[PDB]
Amino acid sequence: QDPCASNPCANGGQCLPFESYICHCPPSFHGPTCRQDVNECGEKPGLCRHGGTCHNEVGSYRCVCRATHTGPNCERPYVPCSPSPCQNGGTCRPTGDVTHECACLPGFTGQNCEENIDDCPGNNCKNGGACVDGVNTYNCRCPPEWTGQYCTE
Ligand SMILES: [Ca+2]
Ligand SMILES: [Ca+2]
Ligand SMILES: [Ca+2]
């Protein structure tokens, strides 16, 4: 005769007997069986600090920060070069309050030096050798019957 044996609650709620039953919900859900989402933005205005916009979700919320701030609740100020966004040992230079510039190392390119420049366009791999791109170079993956740097030996 346990009413909780049927498992009436959902989304992490704990069933407890009382007189029928009750579902003790986690803070992210509410209602008789924890099936309705709590709007965190509505319960605490200014949840996303420094003029951030709160967006409610099923089981959580997300903060949309303005360019000048960062963090889960837009609390940490945005510094263009700390943490540094440039990839592959690239040097970061700030150009403004929110804009930045990456000085790429030879071989890399793009806004944040994330793209490796393809060195295969003018490759000299012969006899069906496949050009494999590297950092400022390339190597030919030769078929089994051919050897050498350009698949000629
Ligand atoms: Ca509701
Ligand atoms: Ca929510
Ligand atoms: Ca390359």
Numbering used by the authors: 141 to 159, 161 to 294
Would you copy out the relevant sentences from the publication that reported this structure?
The Notch receptor is a key component of a core metazoan signaling pathway activated by Delta/Serrate/Lag-2 ligands expressed on an adjacent cell. Notch signaling requires cell-surface expression of a hetero-dimeric transmembrane Notch receptor, which has a large extracellular portion rich in epidermal growth factor (EGF)-like domains (36 in human Notch1 and Drosophila Notch). Key to understanding receptor function is structural knowledge of the large extracellular portion of Notch which contains multiple repeats of epidermal growth factor (EGF)-like domains. Here we investigate the EGF4-13 region of human Notch1 (hN1) using a multidisciplinary approach.
